[PDB]
Ligand binder design. Structure first.
Ligand SMILES: O=C(O)Cc1c[nH]c2ccccc12
Ligand SMILES: O=C(O)Cc1c[nH]c2ccccc12
Ligand code: NI
Ligand code: NI
Lengths: 169, 169
């Protein structure tokens, strides 16, 4: 029984349920490998270990790495926005931003449009560390992503986006 | 400079680097949305919030949920194997298994082939909670995954697997 945004409760078609059972973990030892979120979780976890392990050298962690690349891409950003893009809790994000200010990697500054919003931007040191991050990326990633065509990867991004956009909160 | 498993260091072709730069976060505000791991991370995080939030009712968390569905699919499993499949640290896994024994959801038992290996299996209560997990899955997931064809989803699983298999440790 779902509500689909209403004051009533709806029991979905046995069709929707059959299709969904083609993908759900069940009593069969290989059900799990049909589940797209299983694979998203497994890929995220194996990737997370790889990147943490190799970004080691630069004496930062992947939390700081994402903050820096989000600031880089955006130029100036909402700590909020950086957190969002970096898949972080706002508290985790704020904590790591100040750790990067303390290291002289980013400048934080009151937003000109609205003093409350803390904007973030790189320092000269921030920018050199970006190229270092990009080079460690080259090393660890070039083989993996050169194993796919431009078509496969753009398609995969599209499907991941479609998934991301159907989920709510 | 990479080693590719040898005693020498190799500088990859400017080709591999150009292709890789089609996908990496860079100074362009939309570089990030070309990056497959960005999307894997974002989907994993949005999914994680959704499932934790809705598995709430059953008074378990998604860590326990995955343990139960891995035990379910396998019948009897290595706590090791359950941890692996559930994308958990072995310590996290062992901790949650005993929490589920304490709740009478799983039986733990010395492996018949090798007494050290702790095997896990469901209880009658475990099995009823499986169908409850499957029904909460129906509610929260049926819409999202009925938004894709069988072809799109099997393809997406395949590409995620290919990624998972090229990464190492
Ligand atoms: O969190 C999820 O739903 C995905 C997932 C990762 N490992 C799993 C093991 C069993 C069932 C689902 C999953
Ligand atoms: O962890 C990753 O590499 C993926 C990712 C998630 N959010 C990001 C923001 C900027 C750059 C990469 C990422
Ligand atoms: Ni997960
Ligand atoms: Ni990540």
């Amino acid at each position: 029984g779902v509500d689909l945004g209403t004051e009533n409760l709806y029991f979905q078609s046995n069709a929707m349920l059959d299709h969904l059972e083609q993908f759900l973990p069940n009593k069969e030892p290989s059900s799990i490998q049909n589940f797209p979120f299983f694979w998203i979780s497994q890929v995220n976890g194996k990737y997370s270990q790889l990147i943490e392990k190799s970004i080691k050298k630069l004496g930062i962690d992947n939390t700081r790495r994402k903050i820096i690349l989000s600031t880089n891409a955006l130029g100036e950003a909402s700590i909020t926005d950086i957190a969002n893009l970096s898949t972080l809790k706002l508290t985790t994000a704020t904590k790591a931003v100040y750790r990067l200010v303390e290291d002289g990697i980013v400048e934080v500054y009151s937003s000109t449009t609205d003093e409350r919003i803390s904007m973030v931007k790189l320092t000269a040191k921030g920018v050199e560390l970006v190229e270092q991050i990009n080079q460690i990326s080259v090393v660890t990633l070039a083989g993996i992503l050169n194993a796919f065509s431009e078509d496969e990867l753009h398609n995969l991004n599209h499907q991941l986006k479609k998934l991301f956009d159907l989920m709510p909160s």
